[PDB]
Design an enzyme around this catalytic site. Structure first.
Site, mmCIF file in Angstrom:
data_model
loop_
_atom_site.group_PDB
_atom_site.id
_atom_site.type_symbol
_atom_site.label_atom_id
_atom_site.label_comp_id
_atom_site.label_asym_id
_atom_site.label_seq_id
_atom_site.Cartn_x
_atom_site.Cartn_y
_atom_site.Cartn_z
ATOM 1 N N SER A 94 0.823 -1.201 0.000
ATOM 2 C CA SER A 94 0.000 0.000 0.000
ATOM 3 C C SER A 94 0.862 1.257 0.000
ATOM 4 O O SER A 94 1.555 1.516 -0.980
ATOM 5 C CB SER A 94 -0.958 -0.009 1.188
ATOM 6 O OG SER A 94 -1.972 0.960 1.002
ATOM 7 N N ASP A 215 -9.949 -5.645 -3.225
ATOM 8 C CA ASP A 215 -9.368 -4.606 -2.385
ATOM 9 C C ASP A 215 -10.309 -3.408 -2.324
ATOM 10 O O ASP A 215 -10.613 -2.797 -3.354
ATOM 11 C CB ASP A 215 -7.999 -4.191 -2.924
ATOM 12 C CG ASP A 215 -7.175 -3.442 -1.907
ATOM 13 O OD1 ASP A 215 -7.749 -2.651 -1.136
ATOM 14 O OD2 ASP A 215 -5.948 -3.657 -1.864
ATOM 15 N N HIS A 244 -7.252 -6.365 1.158
ATOM 16 C CA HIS A 244 -6.163 -5.401 1.062
ATOM 17 C C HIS A 244 -4.893 -5.873 1.758
ATOM 18 O O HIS A 244 -3.816 -5.330 1.486
ATOM 19 C CB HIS A 244 -6.617 -4.065 1.654
ATOM 20 C CG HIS A 244 -5.569 -3.000 1.616
ATOM 21 N ND1 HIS A 244 -4.951 -2.601 0.450
ATOM 22 C CD2 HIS A 244 -5.006 -2.272 2.608
ATOM 23 C CE1 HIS A 244 -4.065 -1.662 0.723
ATOM 24 N NE2 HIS A 244 -4.079 -1.444 2.026
#
Length: 263
Positions: A94, A215, A244
């Site tokens: 991320s 996600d 995620h």
């Protein structure tokens, strides 16, 4: 203000190959705990906490400095320069995917390869660009987080994990609750408004885009967008794992894909 012990930098494993495991907002390096077994036998695995991790003394989080990912890049580069381990494969989840991207364009010497999990250069939708979030969408989220942090975590962690993996929800809830809510809110806002699309073309190191199934923050079409726009040699690996946080929810499968993505 981030030192080597401040960000809990640790190098575990053996082997000349250097692997960097860099977690995202809401967790710390323990997010990688289950992936470590698959790489310490043949990698010196570098882990560290983002300044915003609950495991980092919140006094080290300077609000006037961490107004952009660049200060996070400074910490990452300061760590790799402090460790002086040389060329490494960097795994960024991320925000740490964005951080690794920005770090590789400043210091392409440091990174043999970027492995990007849950990567997005921009969450907001734009001109023909789908980040996954309209204008008003994130406001309710930041509102819930500031109004009732515990209720927000209780909802967001199962959403972030995606799959029904109670251990992942537990670990992610834990690290979220370890973060000072003003830091979580400040970083989430800063990170959400970041736009890296204009520097993707400047990447020269090869990247593996590990795209996770369902996600909440990264549409599946993002993998192809990063492939088209990352300036280096980019391969996309569409994860079977939903959610995620594949490194928390399906570490064995993720580690398999991670090992395959290594140079």
């Amino acid at each position: 203000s981030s030192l080597l012990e401040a960000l809990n930098v640790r190098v575990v494993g053996s082997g000349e190959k250097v692997l960097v495991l860099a977690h995202g907002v809401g967790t710390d390096q323990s997010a990688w705990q289950r992936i470590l077994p698959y790489f310490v036998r043949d990698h010196r695995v570098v882990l560290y906490d983002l300044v915003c991790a609950g495991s980092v003394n919140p006094d080290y989080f300077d609000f006037r400095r961490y107004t952009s990912l660049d200060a996070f890049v400074d910490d990452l580069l300061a760590i790799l320069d402090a460790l002086r381990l040389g060329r490494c494969t960097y795994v960024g989840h991320s925000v740490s995917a964005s951080i690794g991207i920005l770090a590789s364009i400043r210091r392409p010497d440091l990174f043999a390869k970027l492995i990007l999990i849950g990567a997005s250069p921009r969450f907001l939708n734009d001109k023909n660009y789908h980040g996954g979030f309209a204008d008003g969408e994130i406001d309710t989220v930041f509102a819930a987080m500031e109004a009732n942090y515990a209720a927000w975590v209780s909802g967001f962690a199962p959403l972030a994990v995606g799959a029904d993996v109670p251990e992942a929800v537990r670990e992610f809830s834990r690290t979220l609750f370890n973060m000072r809510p003003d830091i979580t809110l400040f970083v989430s806002r800063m990170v959400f408004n970041s736009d890296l699309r204009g520097v993707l073309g400047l990447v020269t190191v090869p990247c593996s885009v590990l795209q996770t199934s369902k996600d909440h923050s990264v549409p599946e079409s993002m993998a192809a967008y990063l492939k088209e726009n990352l300036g280096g040699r980019t391969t996309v690996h569409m994860l079977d794992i939903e959610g995620h946080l594949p490194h928390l929810s399906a570490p064995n499968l993720l580690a398999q894909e991670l090992r395959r993505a290594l140079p």
